[PDB]
Design a protein around this ligand. Sequence first.
Ligand SMILES: *[C@@H]1O[C@H](CO)[C@@H](O[C@@H]2O[C@H](CO)[C@@H](O[C@@H]3O[C@H](CO)[C@@H](O)[C@H](O)[C@@H]3O)[C@H](O)[C@H]2NC(C)=O)[C@H](O)[C@H]1NC(C)=O
Ligand SMILES: *[C@@H]1O[C@H](CO)[C@@H](O[C@@H]2O[C@H](CO)[C@@H](O[C@@H]3O[C@H](CO)[C@@H](O)[C@H](O)[C@@H]3O)[C@H](O)[C@H]2NC(C)=O)[C@H](O)[C@H]1NC(C)=O
Ligand SMILES: *[C@@H]1O[C@H](CO)[C@@H](O[C@@H]2O[C@H](CO)[C@@H](O)[C@H](O)[C@H]2NC(C)=O)[C@H](O)[C@H]1NC(C)=O
Ligand SMILES: *[C@@H]1O[C@H](CO)[C@@H](O)[C@H](O)[C@H]1NC(C)=O
Lengths: 866, 885
Amino acid sequence: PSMGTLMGVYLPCLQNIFGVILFLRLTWMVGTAGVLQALLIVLICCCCTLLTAISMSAIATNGVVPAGGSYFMISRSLGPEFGGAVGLCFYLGTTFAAAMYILGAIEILLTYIAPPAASNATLNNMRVYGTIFLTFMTLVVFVGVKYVNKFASLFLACVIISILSIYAGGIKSIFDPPVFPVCMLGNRTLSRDQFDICAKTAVVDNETVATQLWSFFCHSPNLTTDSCDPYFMLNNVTEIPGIPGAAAGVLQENLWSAYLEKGDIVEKHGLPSADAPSLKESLPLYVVADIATSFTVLVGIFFPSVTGIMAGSNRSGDLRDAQKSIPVGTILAIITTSLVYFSSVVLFGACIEGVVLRDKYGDGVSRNLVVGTLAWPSPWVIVIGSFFSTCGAGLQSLTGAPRLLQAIAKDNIIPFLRVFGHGKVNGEPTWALLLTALIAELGILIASLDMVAPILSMFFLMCYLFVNLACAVQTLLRTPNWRPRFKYYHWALSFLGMSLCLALMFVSSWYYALVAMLIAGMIYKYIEYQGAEKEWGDGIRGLSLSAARYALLRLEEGPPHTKNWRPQLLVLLKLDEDLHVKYPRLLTFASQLKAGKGLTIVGSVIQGSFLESYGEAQAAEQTIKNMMEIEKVKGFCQVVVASKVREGLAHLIQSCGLGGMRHNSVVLGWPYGWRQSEDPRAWKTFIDTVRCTTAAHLALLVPKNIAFYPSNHERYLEGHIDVWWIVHDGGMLMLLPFLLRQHKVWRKCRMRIFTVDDNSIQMKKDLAVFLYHLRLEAEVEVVEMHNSDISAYTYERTSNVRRMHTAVKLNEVIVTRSHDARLVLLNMPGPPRNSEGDENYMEFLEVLTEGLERVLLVRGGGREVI
Amino acid sequence: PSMGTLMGVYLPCLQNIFGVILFLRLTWMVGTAGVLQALLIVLICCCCTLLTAISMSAIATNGVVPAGGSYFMISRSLGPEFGGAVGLCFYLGTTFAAAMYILGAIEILLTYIAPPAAIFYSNATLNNMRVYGTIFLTFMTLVVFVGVKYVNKFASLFLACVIISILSIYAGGIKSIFDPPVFPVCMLGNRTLSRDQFDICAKTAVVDNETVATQLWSFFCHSPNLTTDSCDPYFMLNNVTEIPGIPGAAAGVLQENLWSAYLEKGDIVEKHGLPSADAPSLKESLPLYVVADIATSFTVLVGIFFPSVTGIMAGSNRSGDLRDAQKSIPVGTILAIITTSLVYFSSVVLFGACIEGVVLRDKYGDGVSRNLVVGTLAWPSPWVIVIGSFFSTCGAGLQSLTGAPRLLQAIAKDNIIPFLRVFGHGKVNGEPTWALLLTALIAELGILIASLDMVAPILSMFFLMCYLFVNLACAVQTLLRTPNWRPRFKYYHWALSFLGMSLCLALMFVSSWYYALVAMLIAGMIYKYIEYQGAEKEWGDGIRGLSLSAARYALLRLEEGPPHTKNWRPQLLVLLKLDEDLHVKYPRLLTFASQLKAGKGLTIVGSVIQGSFLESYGEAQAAEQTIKNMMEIEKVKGFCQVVVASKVREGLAHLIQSCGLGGMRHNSVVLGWPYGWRQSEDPRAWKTFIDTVRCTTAAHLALLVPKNIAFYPSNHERYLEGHIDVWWIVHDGGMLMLLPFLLRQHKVWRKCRMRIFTVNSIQMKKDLAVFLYHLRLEAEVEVVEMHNSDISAYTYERTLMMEQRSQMLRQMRLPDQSNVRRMHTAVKLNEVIVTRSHDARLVLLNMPGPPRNSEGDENYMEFLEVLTEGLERVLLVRGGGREVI
Ligand SMILES: *[C@@H]1O[C@H](CO)[C@@H](O[C@@H]2O[C@H](CO)[C@@H](O[C@@H]3O[C@H](CO)[C@@H](O)[C@H](O)[C@@H]3O)[C@H](O)[C@H]2NC(C)=O)[C@H](O)[C@H]1NC(C)=O
Ligand SMILES: *[C@@H]1O[C@H](CO)[C@@H](O[C@@H]2O[C@H](CO)[C@@H](O[C@@H]3O[C@H](CO)[C@@H](O)[C@H](O)[C@@H]3O)[C@H](O)[C@H]2NC(C)=O)[C@H](O)[C@H]1NC(C)=O
Ligand SMILES: *[C@@H]1O[C@H](CO)[C@@H](O[C@@H]2O[C@H](CO)[C@@H](O)[C@H](O)[C@H]2NC(C)=O)[C@H](O)[C@H]1NC(C)=O
Ligand SMILES: *[C@@H]1O[C@H](CO)[C@@H](O)[C@H](O)[C@H]1NC(C)=O
């Protein structure tokens, strides 16, 4: 499969864009709204579609492009939810567009080609003929798709020849225009259909006689009468040319808005008219404004002529290089359409009279196509051209909507429309064509372009808005599979497009837009629910599972370092032989340090064998969950069954969490009665866990004397927290007391920073400035720093007899200056590298915290920033 | 602290609801829209507020009630995001309510009490309103700054004034029923003259025995002589009448003003039902007819009326001083709502049935001699309602200026929004300092509009936004089963909150769509900003913090509830085996996992690395990166765990039983096959395999053992001709049937034929078919018969048993018929299967369980090996026992 850019993307988009709006409702819109507001409307209607094209290109470049069609790309790149929701709005837009083309073909057939073979009489004629055409076209679509696919080029050829003839006619108008006199009465517009000639009196047989216009306006067939309307006799009868050759005087005339009302009269601003009352038997003789015109009405009526940019990306499979051929083709088609509309708006505004443009059905002229008056070969080419264009566009929409419905139905996303996949032997849908025809019937029964157009606009605006919103969100939140390769693409453009198309969608009709948005939201949430039920098994619990998995997958990619550091704890509880929580104060302390916000996993090891001890593990899981719910700490609970507690602890420390939801702090208790008993298990297990948690670059919190920690019901009124930051680990040693006091239990305990040659003023200024950002502003008291005393910390981080001496002097200082303290925090030195000096390290740590009622030791990990 | 329901909740709510809208704009609203549509308006505006009150009660019952106020309950019960968003919309509503009350007090001062004291006399009225409103706002701000205590003392007085005013109105009506008052309004044809200028409404009067033109003549006709014919035709063509303006209660007047009478801007107020002969008129007469001031419709009346039913959140404002709040707040709020609704209904009907249809439409009471239209019917004198409404408006304004800065100060001290930290700098006593100034500035910006009919819709928009948010939050938290949300209200159901949200949204859009859009965007912006700040405070980063918070919330919500799903879908854990150089040995397992999941579901990929953790951290990190790259290649979306154990066995066990977080657990273990187990002398392989099998079968997990993984297709390969074979023997039918369907759903097996081979036959086939109908696979069913004692003994089987004995002897160095019987059966089964299913693409058969004795594993391996002998690709599945489908 290989065809170029032109005949694969460009020409289909052109064939889909050029519609009936140009022929039937451009002149009326230009005359009613002027040239300025016309240019503003065209610009507004091209900007939304251009930003949507930018989003479509950004979608069409990331990754490979699926070869199925124009709906499969959207789904593959935005998820089944988005793709499914977009498909239905697009399907409805396409079927109503087919309906609108049928109405246009009927209107062009019954008004100019042949009116004899035909208020509400027109509405009934339109209804009947539109139903007959819809039936015949549906049957044709059933039987003869091959002939449509063969003849599809002809419709584009006719459109191109028509537009070329219009522009050539304009150029011939510039120096020698055609003649099409429109008659005037003062500053009113007479319907030229009835009268033979517009003149009050005519000369027959050497004398003057009343003309048909007189007898039609005056019921008397004798000139000698004075029972007629005052407007007829008071004013004159003029014949101004309707096609003034290109000049700057006409473009000066029709330059300001001319919004009429329902039932008003089409008036030629710039002719002498003396007002007067009038009878009621004359109204069937003036041309009348048919519908109320405004700005929003014109937006709604014109918009369906710039839609169809998603029909270009429809031969993805038979493309040479889609990444470079789809975006350029779409944007070139958009630009070409925008320039044709700009040029046509200016040409119409500046070349034709401002009063003959407002006859929607060409009443000023003798029931001709108002836009067909200027055309070189003959005014008869535009009628046939627009007829074939409307028929071809209707046929192609009726061919392309059921195929899309069958595609959506076989994907099995929405379950209640499984039947619509009952394709033919060849694959052509069977019970989807009937549904489409029924919807087309429901649309034809309205039988008025000016009322079908706003619904169509709502559907297409909804589709485009959803595409743009999806692109913007997926670019913002770093979706895992979303990286576009487009050069001129930035999510700000898609955001602006979403805003613009939403503004249009609400300008046209607020209630219609609300209904469309509610339908879209309902289908979106229903797709999400069904997908959850299909992946996992349950509805609500499935929703929660899907949200969790999506969030974790999105969090996987990206730099794995956070600019700030907050403790996320893993509380290692130690269950008893009877499966009871030994120290329920660790859970209380964890709840006080977290305050119910953050991540808190609670692991525990049970010695034995997994093969025969599963129920014990589950029972312990329930026990820990209950005890954890009581103390009001919101966290998960893991229980593992190991053979020896050492390896269980290791596997728990290095493997807990899912991807980015990892812990970064291990809070383990203190070993009690280690020196009393002869079994040395306790201290070796403790030191081994310490050595294993410092090699994983994790913080460490060892609350000593856990039997004196407060409960939640207790309250403190007088007391002062004590910090004894010695040398290193400053960030977390300063961050802990603040997070602690953030709880009501320590709500007002005074903080005192004690910091063990050097300069006290520079140090004080640094500590104070650092505290300024934190805002704790706690008093700083720096005691003397003796290098000989801290030798133990300096040598181990970066002498056994010396160890004890330094520890006893430090303990003396702290116990004489901080004995009555509430909580004492000091950073502990690292364990020795030699595996045998563990007894000395334990004796050091024990004689260091001798006397303090409540002492918590923290060891930094080294990757802490603040 | 303990005070009852009445004097603690009921009276404050009553005092906050009854406002200035009733007096200044009730009669005008009733006359313009008729009685029926007025009742409909009142009903619509009471239903939204009633449903919001029910939701507020459901909020006020769950748990303990915080003693702070009306904002702390909402926050504690709905989360910082919701609570913060509600606080700002409520704050804006309260400050604009203060603005509206000041406007009402100014209007009542300049129009009825004393009109001479008007600086400007169009736009003169607007300029007078602007100046006087600014002066009042300044003076009220100073008073509120200095004297909050006296306000809290005098708060009862305002309610006393309101109650006496309403009682006087009803007394006037009841006195109207049998003997009404006198208030003649003069008429011209069918128009309405301003009675202020003329002395008497009569074209001519008799003075000194003769008739002379009256002031009305000189005002309508510039000539002071009767003998003139240069006046407008309407005056001479129609007579002048003097109808009573207060007709006593009857069914004829309530029958007259019963249908809508929406006028337009600048039209004339006409009395439908009087003889009128039309004619042209001059342009110097318009200053003498009463004129409609603004264009009237239905939506305009909804917008103007809504601010008279707001304030139901002021009842839950003495939370601390309550006896038992759970039983005292809802009943108090709902009783206040019911009383207000009944008073409005009764007053609408009374006005409709007691006053003329032409004097209701004078917004400023022009038909009567510049009186308060509602004050015409009042027993003691029309002077009680004027002063009553004046003092009530001042008091309500003062209380709003007292209660808005307090709410702002609470929000500022709560530290949710960071840029308004300064607004918590209260005085030494706690009275706000820089929150009062901001409130006064916003109130001035609101006064500069100077028109009740334009200020009321903004107020309504803010309050409607607050209520819609409360209702939506309540409904969502009840639906999704939030962990800490269990309300105790008896008559409460999430359908009611949903209906309330819909109705109040409809109201929010009827008044003015664009204003509603602006309000919704402000609310959404503050909601997302609060969420972002909470993320930055809990975790450390902005964007990544959002994802972590979403994950934690979802897992926590999924924690509670029944832990069994009605369906069973495989969630795999692929146990890869890394090489000695840390390279993936079998990268085909990842391919198979990607084909079986198809990128949707959970897939954890664990692996054990032998050694010591203390010195092998970098190896673990490198292996994790390697697995991530290799996993990205095979297009499988999953997480990756690597642990460092001492023996691979315990690593595998700890990996099997501990992977995930709460409810996001796996339920299927796919491990490969051990190759060369009997070839080599090291027996580690088969014991490791058997140990993992027994450990994964005792946890009730499914099992997938793809044998001969080197012949499985890749993703680029495609299959055109072939048929999957299932050889389901006895049990585990559900999963044995669910696997091939999920398999063929991938394009690699997109069209492989399924054949069900099953070792009364017709009844079983009918059952399989009916079961298959729901699944819809419709695969052909062939039931093969089962033979007995086909081969009594096999010589080769005996030789194999001897070989096994020799193996055991070698192991020792460094009943045969009964044991053989099982091998013989396996040989016969392998014969049938290999002769009827050799050419199959993929073969699935369920494997027997491992033996209970830990030593008979060698025989089990020999059995499993001779079973799949010859088959190119064979996958064995073992059920866990808790599988449902
Ligand atoms: C303005 O007021 C006058 C008088 O109050 C209204 O005209 C009165 O209409 C009644 C009803 O027909 C007349 O009663 C009878 O009129 C006939 C006419 O010939 C007379 O023959 C009878 O003897 C009897 O008077 C009454 O005369 C007539 N009065 C006048 C002065 O016209 C009039 O309808 C009111 N409304 C307007 C002028 O729009
Ligand atoms: C109050 O007095 C005014 C002034 O005469 C009355 O206005 C006129 O009342 C008639 C009552 O039907 C209206 O009749 C309509 O006339 C049009 C022709 O313009 C006709 O097409 C309709 O079918 C109908 O017959 C008339 O429009 C109206 N004219 C004006 C300028 O107001 C008015 O009706 C009297 N009553 C009330 C309740 O206003
Ligand atoms: C066309 O004729 C109508 C007939 O009156 C003109 O209408 C008048 O326009 C003047 C100009 O301001 C107004 O003051 C009158 O009140 C209008 N009378 C009516 C009955 O409409 C109109 O201006 C003429 N020219 C146009 C429409 O361009
Ligand atoms: C009507 O036409 C006559 C003759 O052309 C002319 O004299 C007269 O002024 C015209 N009326 C007006 C209002 O221009």
